[PDB]
Structures are given as structure tokens and as C-alpha cells.
Write a protein that holds these residues in place. Sequence first.
Motif, PDB file in Angstrom:
ATOM      1  N   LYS A   1       1.012  -0.780  -0.271  1.00 11.53           N
ATOM      2  CA  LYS A   1      -0.079  -0.271   0.443  1.00 11.53           C
ATOM      3  C   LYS A   1       1.065   1.380   0.104  1.00 11.53           C
ATOM      4  O   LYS A   1       0.281   2.243  -0.599  1.00 11.53           O
ATOM      5  CB  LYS A   1      -1.222  -0.086   1.218  1.00 11.53           C
ATOM      6  CG  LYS A   1      -2.235  -0.832   1.273  1.00 11.53           C
ATOM      7  CD  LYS A   1      -2.829  -1.114   2.149  1.00 11.53           C
ATOM      8  CE  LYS A   1      -4.428  -2.200   1.930  1.00 11.53           C
ATOM      9  NZ  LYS A   1      -4.700  -2.400   3.384  1.00 11.53           N
TER      10      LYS A   1
ATOM     11  N   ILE B   1       2.490   1.515  -3.669  1.00  7.59           N
ATOM     12  CA  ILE B   1       1.090   1.582  -4.483  1.00  7.59           C
ATOM     13  C   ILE B   1       1.205   3.256  -4.402  1.00  7.59           C
ATOM     14  O   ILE B   1       1.081   4.055  -5.393  1.00  7.59           O
ATOM     15  CB  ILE B   1      -0.113   1.548  -4.151  1.00  7.59           C
ATOM     16  CG1 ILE B   1      -0.346  -0.731  -5.053  1.00  7.59           C
ATOM     17  CG2 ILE B   1      -1.260   2.140  -5.076  1.00  7.59           C
ATOM     18  CD1 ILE B   1      -0.932  -2.162  -4.276  1.00  7.59           C
TER      19      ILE B   1
ATOM     20  N   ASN C   1      -4.277  -3.866  -9.029  1.00  7.87           N
ATOM     21  CA  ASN C   1      -3.559  -2.276  -8.830  1.00  7.87           C
ATOM     22  C   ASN C   1      -2.710  -1.897 -10.611  1.00  7.87           C
ATOM     23  O   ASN C   1      -2.309  -1.131 -10.717  1.00  7.87           O
ATOM     24  CB  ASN C   1      -2.832  -1.351  -7.442  1.00  7.87           C
ATOM     25  CG  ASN C   1      -3.844  -0.968  -6.597  1.00  7.87           C
ATOM     26  OD1 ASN C   1      -4.147  -2.121  -5.826  1.00  7.87           O
ATOM     27  ND2 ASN C   1      -3.555   0.632  -6.694  1.00  7.87           N
TER      28      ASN C   1
END
Lengths: 431, 431
Positions: free
Chosen positions: B331, B334, B365
Motif C-alpha cells: 500500500k 502503491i 493495481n
Amino acid sequence: SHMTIQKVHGREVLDSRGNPTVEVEVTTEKGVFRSAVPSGASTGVYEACELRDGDKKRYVGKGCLQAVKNVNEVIGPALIGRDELKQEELDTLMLRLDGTPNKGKLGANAILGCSMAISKAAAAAKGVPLYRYLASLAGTKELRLPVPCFNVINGGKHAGNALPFQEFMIAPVKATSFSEALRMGSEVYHSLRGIIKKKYGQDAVNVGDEGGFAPPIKDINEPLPILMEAIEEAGHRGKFAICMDCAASETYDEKKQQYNLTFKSPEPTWVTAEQLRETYCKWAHDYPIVSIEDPYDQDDFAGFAGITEALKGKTQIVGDDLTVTNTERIKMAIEKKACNSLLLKINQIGTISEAIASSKLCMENGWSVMVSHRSGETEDTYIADLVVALGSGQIKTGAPCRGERTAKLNQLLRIEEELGAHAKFGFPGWS
Amino acid sequence: SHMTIQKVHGREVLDSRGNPTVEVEVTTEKGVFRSAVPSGASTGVYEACELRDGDKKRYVGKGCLQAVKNVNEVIGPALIGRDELKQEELDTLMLRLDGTPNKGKLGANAILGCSMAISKAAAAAKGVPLYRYLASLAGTKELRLPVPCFNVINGGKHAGNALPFQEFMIAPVKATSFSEALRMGSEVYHSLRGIIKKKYGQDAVNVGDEGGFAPPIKDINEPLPILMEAIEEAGHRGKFAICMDCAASETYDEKKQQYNLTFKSPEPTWVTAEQLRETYCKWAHDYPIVSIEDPYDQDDFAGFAGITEALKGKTQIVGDDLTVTNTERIKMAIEKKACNSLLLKINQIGTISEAIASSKLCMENGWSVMVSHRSGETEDTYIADLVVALGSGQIKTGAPCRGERTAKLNQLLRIEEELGAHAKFGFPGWS
Ligand SMILES: [Zn+2]
Ligand SMILES: [Zn+2]
Ligand SMILES: [Zn+2]
Ligand SMILES: [Zn+2]
């Protein structure tokens, strides 16, 4: 008939050098039983036929598609519907299917995977582990965990270095369990890395084909003090012996009748068999060297016999290329008192039944048996079960490094655990 | 209830470096399902806890008896009688049994073998191969055979040489089947041996931890022309790409904020991240380098983001130590656009459920996923099934050399054969 062989399938897979080899699956209602065939680098002239394709466009001629085709189209169809428990019967069938003394028609590398996988399917049908089933086939009275003989300095055709002789091994002969033997071997291997790095530099600690270090050594005497130092540093003084595999045929020139101790170098270092004999005598005196394999050329029965007599009671002399796991060659060795230990290589002969006969023959004549890998190995663990099954007390299956070696050592841990704390360990003559 | 977990047992076994690791067996009425845990050398600081004993008298402190005891005495008893099909439920149970964010109580190396073996027992209960069962868990729409990325010149913490960067890989991206990919990789590996031997000498052709050659090279640019020459000589011009793993954290000094390109030598060769950036740009221009892993330190999100943007569409940037297969780190990656490929290491996170979540997160993603071995591997083949199950098209599992690497490649051959000639191969963006 629902309990018989349902399917037989061969396929080309990679060995630990990236070379093609043969693997076979035998399917019964009990499952899928998979065996892969190993492959030597220093292969004796009397070994059974390893059949390769010779197509320069695939693996520069090292493909095994023909051997695989022989499994799929010839041997497999003959086995379908057959009782997998009849090991001798089915092994003999495959011998007759081939019809040649050297397995030159179908390939020992087609036949052997079938022989192996049949025996695994059979053990499953019987409801026992493989080692238990094989012990029955062999009439073994006492199972034992073997002392592992770890090839920790690699030379000859197995390594990038000047070192002419093939294998310098350590064996934790005074260990009292396989678990302890393996840990001790690993611990010494680890101290050895540091010793080599310090003496030779970090470029010296990469590994050869069997997971041993490949230092830049030329002299065949030079690894021995290093092995003793490593044993000492690891805290295991007095617990280890040394085993040698000279693989001396690889250095032999027939026309000169001499051995070239620098065959991997520009020059020429010619020595006589007599020069080797006194090297071996000096080795046995100066170190706890308890085993020397192939000290002379594979047809030098007189040289073999001489050193066998000279080191009797101190150092066993192992036939590998001399005997090629073959009862006929073994009978010649017995007659000439050429050696007193068999290196057992299932793919030198090509069936389980014949390999078992070779073991029994040697043992009945007072020899020891050291079950062996080849330098081209797979993830296959068959020889772990086989060595326990034969109760021989001796295995060589690599340094404790590289998965094609550690797979065998780990399988021996599992077998040891199954057998429990009263399971016998080691080779009594070395304990 | 007869269909549940019957027995759970852990044991200490050896990895491909001779170091102890953990293996777990889950027994059901369907059989014995065995999974072993791998172990890294260049381990990221954010990886889940690999629990070792620290007893200097056993393997100089590297024993795994405590992790094994945790399996036998804590995790195993909790699993007995449980429905092995409930992967998420049982993985979560083990997370809660441990109770810490890093698996520091029980060990990721106790938990992971259980997680793996449960999934194999479950696939057997379902009556499908492991890759099929895992594809269901992951919601994968299309299975594929991956392009293998073969680490054929070994450096960093994996080899005895000056070479600071860890992995120089070749990938047969233009192969049209896995069978062909593997043969091509092997053929290049073989021509490479001869090229290295001729240039550096025979002392240069021994292997590092992952089966790649370990030549005496210092300069990080020097292996690249050699890879191109090998590809050419083998007859495969134009069919291959290059992948890099710099493992740059291993060269990083935090206080200096520089990278030491000679960390395995007496001196000191300090370079900046900016000096690395233009090396990487030059690499991508001069060679078909399609993937670069860990080009910067594991907390250098800004450096990562810079090179990811700079090579967008040409070269994927792989987080390994940056991301450690962990949704939380991912995360952060990203958010910062720090990379666009995940190196998936099941033992960086420690459960199958979490490793699957990491894959899905990255793929949703727009990242690629390269399933990976560790440099300390076993005969375990789990990642072969996993990579097919995830349909990612990318695996790195070693040079085509050493059985802990070839076991994976061979399992991929078996899976390919099961799926048939219409099975998809490769990574579409590289094809
Ligand atoms: Zn040999
Ligand atoms: Zn030999
Ligand atoms: Zn790493
Ligand atoms: Zn990495």
C-alpha cells in the motif's frame, strides 16, 4: 485386476547439471509413483547403456526423447495390467524386452525408472514404506541408518579446478545417530568454507557438481590437512574419518600406461601405478582414511588387488568403475581379490533386481556396500530407502549442500524418525 | 469428522546451503502432505520472523528446534480435527495463535509450513491438483505457465566473488511453451559455461547458491555482454530478455547514504543513488533488460519511484525487500508509485492466505507478480503450483542447475503436461 498397473508414462526432466534425463510414473489405484534416473560424469566403460538422442539442435545432443519414447511405446504397454508385486518377474521381462547384454536397445535409462517406480507401487500395495519393501526383496535381516560420506572438496570432472582426483570426503563415523551424523557433517562443511576462504580467497568457496567446495588446488595431497583442520574447528576432533574417490580411470592413458595428475591443465604430469601405491600408503598412515574408491584404472585388477592387500583391516578398497554394480564384473573382482567394497549405482546396471543381486553377492563374499548417487542427480530420493533396505551402513550422496544431495539426507532423517531410537546407525567396522 | 486433519508433525531438515529449516506434515485419510520452508540470505528488515534457536553448539546457532516445537506442541494440536478446506479460517487462527504483527512468537517458519501443507491436504480432499485448488482460493480466471527468469551469473551474498549485485538473469521471453523455455535456458547456461571458462579460466565455472556461475567479476556491468554472447552462441539471438536483482539494500550504508559496490572487498567503492540511476538507464538502453529488482535501498521509496517512472513501458521495477510480500508495505509502494511488480515470497509474510492477498492487491493495481524462491531452498516445489495458480506469467526459481532449483522447473514441466497444448505460456507484455 483392479489392483494392477493402470498407466506407465515417461517424460524428459532436468538433472542437477541442467542436462535432460528420464523420469517415469507408474499409476495404480494406490496413486502415482514417480522415479527419476540419475546420470554420471565419470562413467565407467562397462556401465549399462545410457541412451541419448544425439540431436545437436536439442541440448547439443543430450536429449532423452528416445529413452522416453521407449518407456511410453514399448515398456509401458507391456506393464499395463501386470502385478507390480512381482519385481523379479517384471525386471526380467524388461531385460528380455531389451534383449541385449548392455540394455543398448531400450536404454538402461528407460528400464531403470520403470524398475524403480514398480517397486514403489508395490510397497504401496503392500502398505509398507519403500525401505521395508526393498529389505524384503533383499532378504535383509537388520535395517540400519548409514554413515553418510560427504564429498566436501570436489575435483576431477566434477569441478572447475586443477585437482585431478574426484572426491575428498568426510564421514562422521563416531556419530551415534543419523541426525547427529548429518549435523556434524554440516557443521564441518561450514567451518571448511571459512578455512578455504581465508587460505584461498572468496573466489575459492563456490561449489562443484556434488556441493563440495572447488578451491584452486592442483596437488592431490593438499585437501587432506584442510579436512582435518575443519573437523577440529567444528569441535569434532576424533569423530570423523576420510573417504577418497580417485576416479583414477579418468586420469589414465592406456597407451602410456600412466596416470596424468594434471589432465585439466596445459602440461602433463605422468605418474606410475607404483607412484600412486605409495601415495595411498602414505595417505592411510597420515590420516584416518578408511575408504579409497577406484585407486587405479577400471581394468587394473592387479593394481587393485595389491592395494587391497596392503591396506587390509585399515582401509576398504571400493570398486566403482571396476565393478559397475554388475555381478559379472564383481565375480572377476572376487576371483582376483581386487577390492572389498562395492559402490552400488543402480543406473550402472539398470534394474533394481540386478542391483540387489549385486549387493547380496558382495555381502556374501564379505565385502561392504556403499550405496551411491551419481554426479548428475535429481530430486529423487530412492537411494535413501535403498541403503536402509540393504542395511549396509554406508552411503555417499553428496556434500550437505545442493538440493539433489540434501533431498537424500532429509529422506534419511524421515526414515530414522520412523524407525525410532533403537534403530541401528553406522558402519560397525568404523564405529 | 473422519475427513479432517488427523496429525500435524514438524521436523528440522537441511536446506540447499546445509542450514537447518522447518518441514511440516499434515496427515489426513487422503495421505501425508509435506511442505518445507525456504530461507533467504539477503533478508529484508521488514520480513516476517524467521525463528532460530541461537544454540552455538548446534549449527552455530542456526537450529530450528524451537520453530519445530511450536509446530508440534502449539499449532499442531490446534489443527487436529479441523476442516483443512477452510484455508482463510485456519491461516487466521494461526495468526491469532501467534498474536504478533511479525509472527515473532511462534515463527513465520513454524506457521508457513502448516499453511502450505493444509492447502495441499485440501487440494487432495477436493480431488484436484494443488495449482487448481490455489487458483480457486485466488479467484484466478486464467492459469498460465510462467516465463522462468534464470539467475545464471550469481553475485552479492550468494557467491564467492567481488560482484556486489546479486542476480544477473536470462528469461526466454519469446519461447512459446514452458518446455521450450526450459530447454532454451539450459542451452544458454551451457554455452555460458564455455564462454566463462575461456575468458576467466576453469576456476571461474563453479556455482553460487542459486546455481549460477560465480566468475571472478567485480564490475556490475561486466556480466551483461557475456549473457548476450551466450544467448547468441546457443542459437537463441533475439529470443531472450535480461532480468536484474541488485538487492541494493545489502550494499547500502544508512549513515553515509551511499551504496558500496565493493562491500566484499578490502576497500570501499561509494556511489550515490543518482550514480545508480544513470547506470540503470544505460542498462535499459544497451540491453533487453525488462526487469530490475530492488534497484535501491528498501526504504528508498523516492529513488524507487524515480526509476519506475523513468523506465515505464520498458522495464518493470520489482519490489522485493521494499514490499516483503506484505499488503501494508505494498500500500505504501502503491501510494508512492514506487514500483510496478511484486516479488512474491511466501516466507516473507508467512501464510498462504496473506501471500494470495498480496498478489491480488498488486494485480488489481496493475502490477505484475513474479513468484520467487529464496536463496536457501529445499526439494519443496510449492512455488511451481503457486505461480501457475496465480496466472502471473513470471517465476524466478534459480539457474537450471542444482536440484532445489530444478525440482521447481521439473514440476512446471509436469503441470504444463497436465494442462495440454492450449495452456497459455509466458508474460504477455514480454512476448
Ligand atoms: Zn564415476
Ligand atoms: Zn566413483
Ligand atoms: Zn534478498
Ligand atoms: Zn531479491
